Design a protein around this ligand. Structure first.
Ligand SMILES: [Zn+2]
Ligand SMILES: [Zn+2]
Ligand SMILES: [Zn+2]
Length: 178
């Protein structure tokens, strides 16, 4: 197994996957690493199993269909993994905890949003469809773009949104287009 957490790339108290060489901190894994379960399989392994059980699940899909899916166990898992993939980028630090807004010439968003709030919402099964989760994730970056206006710091939102969108298209097998 790896000697650093797959998400934050730090050592510490790590839990090891039994089916692949990744390791995690307890709360870096999503969902949080389970109390017992020997053997234990990480989310990367669980996602791979879905695809192997139903190879046709990798054929292309329309985003509009994906968004209307109900949050059954498999879609819940895919959203958890997509959230995890965003936390894997170090620039997610800017969007993790609850923001505050006091900048000359700007007004804070009507509906603040951040990664830890989405994480909690997923944990508490607050989303009924994929659309709920995707809307909140996109709202994080849209709020950032609007607030920071022409400051170059706006680019961090563009950057992290691109990681989200690429991973969304991969995990949910969105039909490739020009
Ligand atoms: Zn970690
Ligand atoms: Zn694994
Ligand atoms: Zn199948």
């Amino acid at each position: 197994n790896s000697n650093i957490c797959e998400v934050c790339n730090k050592w510490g108290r790590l839990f090891c996957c039994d089916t692949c060489p990744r390791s995690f901190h307890e709360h870096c894994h999503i969902p949080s690493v389970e109390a017992n379960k020997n053997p234990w399989s990480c989310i990367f392994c669980r996602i791979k199993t879905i695809q192997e059980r139903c190879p046709e699940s990798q054929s292309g899909h329309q985003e509009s269909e994906v968004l209307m899916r109900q949050m059954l166990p498999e879609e819940q898992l895919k959203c958890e993994f997509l959230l995890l993939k965003v936390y894997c980028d170090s620039k997610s630090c800017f969007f993790a905890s609850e923001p505050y807004y006091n900048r000359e010439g700007s007004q804070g968003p009507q509906k603040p949003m951040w990664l830890n709030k989405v994480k909690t919402s997923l944990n508490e099964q607050m989303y009924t469809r994929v659309e709920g989760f995707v809307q909140d994730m996109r709202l994080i970056f849209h709020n950032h773009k609007e607030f920071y206006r022409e400051d170059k710091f706006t680019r961090l939102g563009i950057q992290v949104q691109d990681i989200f969108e690429k991973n969304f298209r991969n995990i949910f097998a969105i039909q490739e287009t020009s």
